[PDB]
Amino acid sequence: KRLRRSAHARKETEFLRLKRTRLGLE
Amino acid sequence: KRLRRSAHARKETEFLRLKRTRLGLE
Amino acid sequence: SELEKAVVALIDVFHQYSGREGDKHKLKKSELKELINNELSHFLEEIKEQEVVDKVMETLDSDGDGECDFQEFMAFVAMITTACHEFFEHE
Amino acid sequence: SELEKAVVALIDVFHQYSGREGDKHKLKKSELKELINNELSHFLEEIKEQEVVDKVMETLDSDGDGECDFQEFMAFVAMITTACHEFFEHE
User: Fold this and answer.
1) CA of C87, closest CA in chain A: separation in Å?
2) What class is the C1-91 domain?
3) Which of helix, strand or coil describes residue B12?
């Protein structure tokens, strides 16, 4: 039922990882 | 002796006048 | 002084890129993409994903015209810079 | 990296003042005053009246702490920079 149909995945992560990393220090 | 005191706000405007101008120029 | 310099740099860089596809006040998704890839390279890694540039723009795109206004750019800059400031607590 | 340079300049300048009275991510009125006078040296006129330096932070002081966060400073920068952009573009 829950197939991998969600092509609209969080590709954002690919770049935003760096932002998350910089936020990480807080 | 006396002067036309800060009825017309004054305090903000002495700095913000140029900000008002910068918005005013659009 | 320094903040003014930084600011006019932001204004100028944005303005010219915004002149290419947009209209000076607004970066089209092409320009936002290019700007990020070309200039934000150390803060964000390169972005081939025309989907994602559109998404991160769309997230802020008050005009809903497939661009981001200088205001939205400044808003984006604010959070990006803040994340970098959080980093900078431990350079 | 033009905007990256600008961005780190904002952070560095802010931290320099914010380290003095505040906590690196927070400008107290003493710091806020000298920071804005010093940095917006053409952009603003000498912000003599401490009541107003207090007011302009209070206006943005989300934190209600009597010292404005880097976020609120970034909001100030955003409005100022937008006004400059508009003014400088529409000569």
Assistant:
1) 5
2) mainly alpha
3) coil
